[PDB]
Amino acid sequence: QVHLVESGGGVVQPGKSLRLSCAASGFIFNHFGIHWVRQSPGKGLEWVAVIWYDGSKKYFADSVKGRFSISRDNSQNTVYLQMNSLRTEDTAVYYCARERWSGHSYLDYWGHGALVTVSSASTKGPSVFPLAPSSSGGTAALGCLVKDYFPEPVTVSWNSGALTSGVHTFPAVLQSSGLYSLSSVVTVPSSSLGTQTYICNVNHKPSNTKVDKKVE
Amino acid sequence: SNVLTQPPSVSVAPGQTARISCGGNNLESKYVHWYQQKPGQAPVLVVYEDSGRPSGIPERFSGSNSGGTATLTISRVEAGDEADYYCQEWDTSSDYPVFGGGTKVTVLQPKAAPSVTLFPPSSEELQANKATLVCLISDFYPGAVTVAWKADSSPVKAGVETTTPSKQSNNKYAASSYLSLTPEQWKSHRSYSCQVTHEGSTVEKTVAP
């Protein structure tokens, strides 16, 4: 069963470097060339690079020529894409893919993708604000606003995981400031607002920050 | 160099046949391959060498390359066929392959109006000299909304940040929108509103200081 496993993604500032890896299994590694194809947020597929089955040819898209290099280690069944002098427009999900034949053919197996984010923003923990229940049909909506953090991801639980039904945590928005915001809301019985405590647990691992915000 | 041209989008009713064209030069003499990419997933090969069907691809997907045009035909369309489809060639004379820009196939499914919840700024944020209104939009279908804000009855564009819709567990869509204000702007108006338009109908929620 052909299987491709990518790693090495992450978040960097412009001008820095990243090295992606593609670990292969289930085929004779050195009989196949390996490609990289990327996808900017919201946009189509863009071919990036190829290394030939025998490492004898390496080609790169004009958009990355001179900045990217590629290598293969047949001992470890792995391909490495070295990305130097990264630019914000290099932000993308990067896929490795196996080519069926020795050039001029098609990509028959694809990895699951490695996320690469190139941004001038600096790591920042969130400001968490309660979204208090106020004044639909016996149920109340309350939530927390997770404001101005960087980078993704943030996770949210309620009551340390004891409250799961009626929870909806929304995907974040990326703002013009370069920081993110997201919200999590739960619907509960109006009658419970005087007797039950509601706390949202916000975890931002990239800044080693956790916030437990009491709502109401 | 060579370019492959595909239509940006195709709409098709469940059970009907979708046809995606791929134009380029001298396709009589070249292989054209096709890839499927469903939202949030990696691409998958769905046609190789004009008409070959890869392992795991339904028989309803059929590639062809005839008269200089390559076509992916999806027969008896299912909702699960909603995806972006890309054609690809690799000329003898080119060091690298060429992809088309992709065709988005949407499958024509029970509509649902959005639920809208609007929260005013918290007192905590206001005493930190900031103000954010939060508009949460859930359970709508198809996945396209437009979001407008108003201060009293005047449209507001500055300070607005809105997500693109994303699919929920139940196959409906959700989105959110944020309006950033100064405290003085929040306190100086009678009300603010989040208006969500969907398939021509609007759901509007209002809050007041």
Residue numbers in the entry:
A (entry chain H): 1 to 9, 11 to 30, 35 to 59, 62 to 72, 74 to 143, 147 to 227
B (entry chain L): 1 to 9, 11 to 29, 36 to 57, 65 to 72, 74 to 80, 83 to 125, 127 to 227
From the publication, what sentences describe this entry?
The zoonotic Rift Valley fever virus (RVFV) can cause severe disease in humans and has pandemic potential, yet no approved vaccine or therapy exists. The M gene segment encodes the glycoprotein precursor (GPC) and the nonstructural protein NSm which is post-translationally cleaved into the nonstructural protein NSm, Gc and Gn. These latter two glycoproteins together form an icosahedral lattice that mediates viral attachment, entry, and fusion. We structurally analyze and characterize the binding mode of a prototypical potent Gn domain-A-binding antibody that blocks attachment and of an antibody that inhibits infection by abrogating the fusion process as previously determined.
We chose RVFV-268 as the lead antibody in this study based on its potent activity against RVFV. The potent Gn domain A antibody, RVFV-268, did not block the interaction of LRP1 Cluster IV and Gn. We observed a stark reduction in the half maximal inhibitory concentration (IC50) value of the Fab of RVFV-268 compared to that of the IgG1 molecule. The F(ab′)2 form of RVFV-268 retained the potent activity of the full-length IgG1 molecule. Although the Fab form of RVFV-268 still neutralized the live attenuated RVFV MP-12 vaccine strain, the loss of activity observed indicates that bivalent binding [mediated by IgG or F(ab′)2], rather than steric interference of the Fc domain (possible only with an IgG), drives the potent activity of RVFV-268. Although Gn domain A antibodies can block attachment and exhibit potent neutralizing activity, antibodies of this nature do not appear to directly compete with LRP1 receptor clusters for binding to monomeric Gn. This observation suggests that RVFV-268, which lost activity when the IgG form was converted to a Fab, uses a bivalent mode of binding to cross-link Gn protomers on the viral surface, concealing the access point by which the LRP1 receptor may be entering. RVFV-268 lost partial ability to bind to Gn proteins with T173L or E175G mutations and lost all capacity to bind to a Gn with K294E-D230N mutations. The relative protection conferred by the antibodies corresponded to the in vitro IC50 values for neutralization in that the more potently neutralizing the antibody, the lower the dose needed to achieve statistically significant protection in vivo. The Gn domain A attachment-blocking antibody RVFV-268 has a lower IC50 value for neutralization and protected animals in vivo at a lower dose than the less potently neutralizing fusion-inhibiting mAb RVFV-140.
